[PDB]
Design a binder for this molecule. Structure first.
Ligand code: 38Z
Ligand code: CL
Length: 351
């Protein structure tokens, strides 16, 4: 039917006439992602429909995604090509964000096949190369995991989903034991459960280490079944924290919890991953340190021997400038966040 609003799994994707021939890709709490044909550029693209305006938290994640991705430009970070929304604030219920179409994601890929060492190494390199750019703006991704790493048919990898992203804020990292956390459980560093809000760059390095382990074995390394179980999973492999590491934890409840557990020595990575490359395991070891202060940085990780075929600091760019997001943004009413989303999307108007 000419001028029809196309439906994707019962959801209207009102993106014509520029974009048509919508096909479902996937969905989540965020909304739904589809592919479409772009009649201007004459190519298929990804378009996601986000409808966040009923809740302040959904609006925070939407604004954060937009504000970061409109500024970032890097080969290993997904961009924004276009954004569609209504011409007035009152009419705007949906934001459609158009992005490059990729072939798959690392979650799908790791369910489908074992990767060669070459592919593990090269995917790792690209994750780190993207993360160097992200960290250079003092941005923390905070939700790295296989489903947020998009891959095309030439094995190019792009990092996506900046809804939980924040700025490095070591002054305010501290929190109590068992503080609720929004990012994906299996990729949470141990300190999230002990004393950390995840406001330092070490949070993302931990998640990368989890991703590397998962590329080595085709299963998540620390699949906790609930919040505290995640910490227990971690401690089952890393073993009991040393006295020095315990002395960096002054939360009484965290300390007393850790000190009640059975004494256990670190499980050797070579025993967990007996067919993996020794250099990959060395780098894994450096990423999955219990103490975040001792954890490898992104630049150090790029320079690690495992990555030597690809490492090229003349070809690993950084951001123009760091970003700032004040905590007081998190307290703005949702209609104020809506106004900001309206402003940020204005330069893609009209449709
Ligand atoms: O960017 C994202 N996905 C993309 C992108 C480009 C793609 N090209 N090709 C593919 C592809 C993937 C797999 N297989 C083949 C092809 C792409 C996938 C994801 C989808 C969503 N996105 C983040 C995002 O749009 N925001 C952060 C979360 N936020 C948000 C989060 C939660 C809620 C929420 N709403 C209701 C209940 C609970 N939470 C609302 C908004 C909206 C903004 C990351
Ligand atoms: Cl502490």
């Amino acid at each position: 039917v000419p001028g029809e609003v196309e439906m994707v799994k019962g959801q209207p994707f009102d993106v014509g006439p520029r974009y048509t021939q919508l096909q479902y890709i996937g969905e989540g709490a965020y909304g739904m992602v589809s592919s479409a044909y772009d009649h201007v550029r004459k190519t298929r693209v990804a378009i996601k429909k986000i409808s966040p305006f009923e809740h302040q938290t959904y609006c925070q994640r939407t604004l954060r995604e937009i504000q970061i991705l409109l500024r970032f430009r890097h080969e290993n970070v997904i961009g924004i090509r276009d954004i569609l929304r209504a011409s007035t604030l009152e009419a705007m219920r949906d934001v459609y964000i158009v992005q490059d179409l990729m072939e798959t994601d690392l979650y799908k890929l790791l369910k489908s096949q074992q990767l060669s060492n070459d592919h593990i190494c090269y995917f790792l390199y690209q994750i780190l190369r993207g993360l160097k750019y992200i960290h250079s703006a003092n941005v923390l991704h905070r939700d790295l995991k296989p489903s947020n790493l998009l891959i095309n048919t030439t094995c190019d990898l792009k990092i996506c989903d900046f809804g939980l992203a924040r700025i490095a804020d070591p002054e305010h990292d501290h929190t109590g034991f068992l503080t609720e956390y929004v990012a994906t459980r299996w990729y949470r560093a141990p300190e999230i459960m002990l004393n950390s809000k995840g406001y330092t760059k070490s949070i993302d390095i931990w998640s990368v280490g989890c991703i590397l382990a998962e590329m080595l074995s085709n299963r998540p390394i620390f699949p906790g079944k609930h919040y505290l179980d995640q910490l227990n999973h971690i401690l089952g492999i890393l073993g009991s924290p040393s006295q020095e590491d315990l002395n960096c934890i002054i939360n009484m409840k965290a300390r007393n919890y850790l000190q009640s557990l059975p004494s256990k020595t670190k499980v050797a990575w070579a025993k967990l991953f007996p067919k993996s490359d020794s250099k990959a395991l060395d780098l894994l070891d450096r990423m999955l340190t219990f103490n975040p202060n001792k954890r490898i940085t992104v630049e150090e990780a790029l320079a690690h021997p495992y990555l030597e075929q690809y490492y090229d600091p003349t070809d690993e760019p950084v951001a123009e400038e760091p970003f700032t997001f004040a905590m007081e943004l998190d307290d703005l009413p949702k209609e104020r966040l809506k106004e900001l989303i309206f402003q940020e999307t204005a330069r893609f108007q009209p449709g």
